[PDB]
Amino acid sequence: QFPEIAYPGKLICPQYGTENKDGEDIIFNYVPGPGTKLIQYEHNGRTLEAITATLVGTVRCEEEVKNILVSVLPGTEKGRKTNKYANNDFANNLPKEGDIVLTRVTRLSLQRANVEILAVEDATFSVSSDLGETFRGIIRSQDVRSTDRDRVKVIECFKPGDIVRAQVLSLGDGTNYYLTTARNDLGVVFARAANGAGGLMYATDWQMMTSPVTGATEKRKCAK
Template sequence: MGEDSEWVTPGEVLGKASKFKAGRGAYVSPDNLTVYASLTGLRRILSPRPDSPDQRPTVEVTGHKAHGAIPEPGSIVIARVTKVMARMASADIMCLGTKSVREKFTGIIRLQDVRATEIDKVDMHMSFHPGDIVRAVLSLGDARAYYLSTAKNELGVISAQSAAGATMVPISWTEMQCPLTGQIEHRKVAKVGG
């Protein structure tokens, strides 16, 4: 499939856009119509399919040692809450979309990113507990962590354990219930389906 594979880093020239299409891990600069690498990895040239109207080969960069997925802004992630503080919760990112991540990425859900409305009334301890599994969208972070947002109906806690050790059932957007004890706990619950 890929004939030549050479090591490249972000910003490195992969070829001219007149000769190559930009594939994964590559982009075309509109200024000089040159294809550049957008990540570190192996440069590969993929031949076009015989029935393709565009007969330019595709140049792509694949992450080194099957690097697993890398979080990017706008990605939907699944994360496990590790710590809840007054103004934020930290979480370990476990999956990007449907792909599991091989490295440890840390995310932070800030108070203002928990929900879209009534932000001043958000209580972190009533939104998340350590161990909760949340679905969130990634926004830009700093060097230490990615910022995660649950400020959409379909984002928030998707799985939580009750004190009795059972998987809780969502009963509203703000509450989950233990099927064993009937105990209700507050959460920022992700709306399922519809």
């Protein structure tokens, strides 16, 4: 029995707890999760491995003699629906491996396309100005398409300023992430003609994008 709301410092439960139910004693294995930490406390000269919450929100328990994933999600259940923690959720939720992100092409190299991660999955997502919190990745030429990976042309697949929906591969070199677009649902999802100097273009073929009003066509690596 734990209080629903929690503050950083409120003791939740030790790593071991028992209770008699239906004449069958069970022992709970409480492991730390996102929002807790094992803190030793002293009241009579003997230590104990208790779990102490370190976030502002509600406590939630899950399962994988079983183990219990004791964690604290930040914010109130009414605040999560209003999404009042959009800026805090972007920085705290780093893009793990295998995630899907929405980036923006900022630099085109002959063998790579430097992008800037703007969102990430949580379809719901999470996105944060002078905040100073932004991630960046690199879309290598070998990860642009699945059909004929080597010997491609990134100038015909991306342009600076285009929005690209790409799935991450792994942490590139610590400085940058490694993304890929070798799927039909991955690629340019929002671009504009003449590097933003034209009209809003829309995806048509697997490698063709066109604007309705201007009628101009430009080759990309679309997603549909």
